Design a protein around this ligand. Sequence first.
Ligand SMILES: Nc1ncnc2c1ncn2[C@@H]1O[C@H](COP(=O)(O)OP(=O)(O)O)[C@@H](O)[C@H]1O
Ligand SMILES: Nc1ncnc2c1ncn2[C@@H]1O[C@H](COP(=O)(O)OP(=O)(O)O)[C@@H](O)[C@H]1O
Ligand SMILES: [Mg+2]
Ligand SMILES: [Mg+2]
Ligand SMILES: [Mg+2]
Ligand SMILES: [Mg+2]
Ligand SMILES: [Mg+2]
Ligand SMILES: [Mg+2]
Ligand code: NA
Ligand code: NA
Lengths: 342, 353
Amino acid sequence: FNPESYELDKSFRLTRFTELKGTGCKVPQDVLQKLLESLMPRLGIGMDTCVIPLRHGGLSLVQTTDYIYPIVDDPYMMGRIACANVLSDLYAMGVTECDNMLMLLGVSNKMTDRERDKVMPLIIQGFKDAAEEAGTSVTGGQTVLNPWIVLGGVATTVCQPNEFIMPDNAVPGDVLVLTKPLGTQVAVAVHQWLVVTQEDVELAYQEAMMNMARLNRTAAGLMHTFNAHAATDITGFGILGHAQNLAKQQRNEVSFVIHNLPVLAKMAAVSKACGNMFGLMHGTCPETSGGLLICLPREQAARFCAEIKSPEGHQAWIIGIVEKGNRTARIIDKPRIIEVAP
Amino acid sequence: SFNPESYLDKSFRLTRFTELKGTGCKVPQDVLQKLLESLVMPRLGIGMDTCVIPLRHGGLSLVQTTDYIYPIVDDPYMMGRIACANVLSDLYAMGVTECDNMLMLLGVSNKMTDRERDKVMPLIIQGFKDAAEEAGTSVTGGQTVLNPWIVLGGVATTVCQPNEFIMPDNAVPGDVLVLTKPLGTQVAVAVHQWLDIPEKWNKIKLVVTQEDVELAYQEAMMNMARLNRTAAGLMHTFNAHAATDITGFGILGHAQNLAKQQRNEVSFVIHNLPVLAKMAAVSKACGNMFGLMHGTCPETSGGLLICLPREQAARFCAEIKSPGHQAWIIGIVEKGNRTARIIDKPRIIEVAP
Ligand SMILES: Nc1ncnc2c1ncn2[C@@H]1O[C@H](COP(=O)(O)OP(=O)(O)O)[C@@H](O)[C@H]1O
Ligand SMILES: Nc1ncnc2c1ncn2[C@@H]1O[C@H](COP(=O)(O)OP(=O)(O)O)[C@@H](O)[C@H]1O
Ligand SMILES: [Mg+2]
Ligand SMILES: [Mg+2]
Ligand SMILES: [Mg+2]
Ligand SMILES: [Mg+2]
Ligand SMILES: [Mg+2]
Ligand SMILES: [Mg+2]
Ligand code: NA
Ligand code: NA
């Protein structure tokens, strides 16, 4: 995306139409659980999708919703990233197919009509192609004026019981697998700012951009192939936030321990230099369109890692262990930081 | 019937955490259409009120819908009830009386202190929850984000057998048009916000009193929290041919949208308009701000507009009213080219509280 390539000015930045926060835009985890107080397997609020058994066919309706604001300055990719973020919640349940999507848009009241008319069709394009890759399509939605640009949607599947994997079958000795590297907030943060070189910055942003656009759909499928016991996706609450919520969901008395952190190279050094702006090393640094965190028996684990890389392929990491415990999660006192080069 | 005193600033208003416009906040119909251009059992995609998606499973099809809005009333719990009624309002356009699940869409203003949050956001949530229970459904997922504004919406989804819904495409000449709630909500909510503004009140004051505005507001609030579900069930009983619901694009914007969908070569003509008492006078005192007389005034959680056999519309109204809230026959269907209009001098019916 070259702005001036679209009769737009030089100073335009899609990221102008929102604010940047080190800790993200979502309402914090403890506050939501509080406010959300008045509210065949079935799954209510608390996890990555709902699972609502139906009257018809012993079928279950599985659905999920998402919305975010611009984090990269390339409108096509950002819509790809939007559509991918919605579908991620489905994939943490293992459902490889999407029966239907609805799209949420918010058009900023600060953008010229000419900016809107160039930038929106690009975004709407990124969303469609990504949906096509997922084997689905958008058939409705809602579009309204807002102070900021908003992007989001709904994914919905009507499943037979074999299609999904309840997020709660972990046992002591399983290992934790993560399929995308950490640090997406830091990378988007520093790029807008244009310890690290201008070159270190551009390679990071381009890499984070690419990984955010990649679908968790292949991973969902290999969780069946390799008999996964539970999974979540890593989004706004960060690696530790989502780990802690998965754990509390377990049927068995287990606890999670994460040993190493696969981070986009150089981004650890940035978060570190910014004290408590991010908290990358504490595990609460928000992710966007992160990968899957999966509880797999030790044998299924290397095999799963081998096949995701060389099926097109993408690397995944062994990051921690499942142990007898009281359903909590924690990162170790001094984690190993794997620096993953572009 | 709300006061920030118990629970906030005596000055606290919920409608402060957005920005009110006579023409509402939607991306205008026309602009919208040219942004979406890219994107056997009957099917329904983008355009009307819901999708209808045939699933490879025992003759089922997916029916669903979404919506989001901003505060238009200062009563939080009642704002919860209304944001939910509006999400469902779309399901009820297809004659679909059941809802198999809901999700919520929630935004907190980054402008509202922590005290205000843990006191106000519960109210909205319980209202939403109370509405879903009335509709015999519940909220089992959603999304909650910071925004400059307070944000309210959600998702409604049903998995339907073939005769659970009514395809909005089978209108014929001689059919008539029933409206199930009176118009003018965008005027009523506005004027309740203009009490607190000296420059706006000084002008409208020549046209209505404080008690009348208090009144039209309270009436508007109850109508907008009123579900369309009963109307939905009666569409089946009295052989409805087609319906759409009246929301952001006004009585005409949405009448035109539905006349586009018809199989037959038919058009709609609207002869009268039921409108909350006094609101149409207020509209005129404000120039081209609203356009409540031309049919381009925004409604939120407005009514259903139903094409009914000329012989049946009358039983329908009797039934919806006697057992109840009144409905009105506002026009007719005739041979035409899939368009719709308001007659030049429409008859205004002043619905009192
Ligand atoms: N971002 C979007 N992507 C795809 N379809 C959309 C989007 N926004 C709105 N729509 C669809 O456009 C049509 C008109 O929108 P709207 O006026 O909001 O009607 P409704 O509330 O009755 O669905 C509807 O079918 C709606 O689902
Ligand atoms: N306003 C709301 N109403 C109902 N459920 C909600 C709401 N906000 C969040 N949730 C639910 O609370 C849980 C936490 O939200 P979130 O972290 O956004 O989940 P996820 O990222 O897995 O989609 C999710 O299960 C979500 O469905
Ligand atoms: Mg998730
Ligand atoms: Mg999510
Ligand atoms: Mg809508
Ligand atoms: Mg509608
Ligand atoms: Mg609607
Ligand atoms: Mg979420
Ligand atoms: Na979810
Ligand atoms: Na809809």
